[PDB]
Amino acid sequence: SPGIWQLDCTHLEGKVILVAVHVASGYIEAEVIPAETGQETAYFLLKLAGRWPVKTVHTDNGSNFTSTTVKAACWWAGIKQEDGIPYNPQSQGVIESMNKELKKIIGQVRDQAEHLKTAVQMAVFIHNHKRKGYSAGERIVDIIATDIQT
Amino acid sequence: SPGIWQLDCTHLEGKVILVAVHVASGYIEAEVIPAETGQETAYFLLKLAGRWPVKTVHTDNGSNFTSTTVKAACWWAGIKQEDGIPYNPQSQGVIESMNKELKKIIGQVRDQAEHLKTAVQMAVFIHNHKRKGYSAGERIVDIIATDIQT
Ligand SMILES: C=CCN(Cc1ccccc1C(=O)NC(c1ccc(OC)cc1)c1ccc(OC)cc1)Cc1ccc2c(c1C(=O)O)OCO2
Numbered sequence A, B: 001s002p003g004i005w006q007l008d009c010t011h012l013e014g015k016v017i018l019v020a021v022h023v024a025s026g027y028i029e030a031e032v033i034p035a036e037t038g039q040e041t042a043y044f045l046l047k048l049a050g051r052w053p054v055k056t057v058h059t060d061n062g063s064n065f066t067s068t069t070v071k072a073a074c075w076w077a078g079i080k081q082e083d084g085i086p087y088n089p090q091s092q093g094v095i096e097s098m099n100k101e102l103k104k105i106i107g108q109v110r111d112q113a114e115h116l117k118t119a120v121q122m123a124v125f126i127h128n129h130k131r132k133g134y135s136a137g138e139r140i141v142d143i144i145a146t147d148i149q150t
C-alpha cells in the first residue's frame, strides 16, 4: 500500500543507523543516533510522517513496538503501529540486502566526510536516485500521486 | 518548476529554525540548529536533495550563497545554487507570512514537548497536512509526479 513503511536499525562505527523504508517503492529516509531509544525512534517517526503520508509502520523490534513514547508519537501523527514480523519470509532477506547495499555505499563515500551522518545522507541520496527504469524516488511519488487521484 | 526550493532562516528561543520551502506547493521541511553556519546549511541541503528531486535552491542570504561548504554540497547533490532575491516582491511577504504561521503553530504545540525541535517537527506535520481543496503534501507529490510523466 502507498502508506506502508518498515523500520530497520543497523550498526556502524559504534553508532546506530535508523532507516525507514517505504515498502512498495524501496525509497528510504535514514538518520544516525548514538543508540536506539523509544525517544529517538519516536522523533524519527514524527519527522517521517510530517514529510510523507505515513499510514502504517512495521516497527523494527518488540521494544519499539512496546515503547510508550513510540506509541505516543504514532498516536500523535496518526500512524498505525504494527509489528514487523516477516509473515512473508522474503522480507528478512530484503532488509538484509538493503543494509548490506547501504553499508557498501557508505564505504564508497566514507572518505568524503568526517562525520558518519554525512556519509549516511550521501548514501540515502545515491540509494533513492539509483535507476533500476525508475528510481525509488520516482516510484514513491508515482505511487502516492496515483493514490491521491482516488 | 517542480524542482525549485527556497531556503528561509527564522529565530525562536535563542535558536535558529532552517526551513526549505518547495515554492510551487508550499510544502516545507525544517530543522532546529544552534546557529546558521555553512556546514549546517550544507548538511540540511544534502538531506533535502536525497528526499526530493531538488534542482534549484534560492539561498536565504549572501553568506550561504558565498559559503564554499554550501557550494560543495550543492555540487555534490546536483543542485543549482541561486540567490533568493525577491525579483518578484510578493516573495518577501509570502516567506514572512510562512514564518508567522509556523511560529503560531509552534506556540499551539509548544507545551506538548520539552524540546523545541519536537514542536518544530509537529508544526511541519500540521503545515504539510493542512487543506487549503488539497494540502501542500498532496500538491508537491502531484507536481512532481506530473513532471516525471514527461
Ligand atoms: C568544513 C566542512 C566539514 N567537512 C570537511 C571534510 C572532512 C573530512 C573529509 C572531507 C571533508 C570535506 O570537506 N568534504 C566535502 C567534499 C568535498 C569534495 C568532494 O568531492 C568528491 C566530496 C566531499 C563536503 C562538503 C560539503 C558537504 O555538505 C553536505 C559535505 C562534504 C565536510 C562536512 C560539511 C558539512 C557537514 C559535515 C561535514 C563532515 O565532515 O561530515 O558534517 C555535517 O555537516
Ligand SMILES: C=CCN(Cc1ccccc1C(=O)NC(c1ccc(OC)cc1)c1ccc(OC)cc1)Cc1ccc2c(c1C(=O)O)OCO2
Pocket: A038, A039, A040, A042, A043, A046, A069, A070, A072, A073, A076, B111, B112, B113, B114, B115, B116, B118, B119
Ligand atoms: C519521555 C519523552 C520526552 N518528552 C516528554 C515531554 C516533555 C514535556 C512535555 C511533554 C512531553 C511528552 O511526554 N509529550 C508526548 C505527548 C503526549 C501526549 C500529547 O497529547 C496532546 C502530546 C504529546 C510526546 C510523546 C512522544 C513524542 O515523540 C515525537 C512527542 C511527544 C517528549 C519527547 C519524545 C521524543 C523526543 C522528544 C521529546 C521532547 O520532550 O521534546 O524530543 C526529541 O525526541
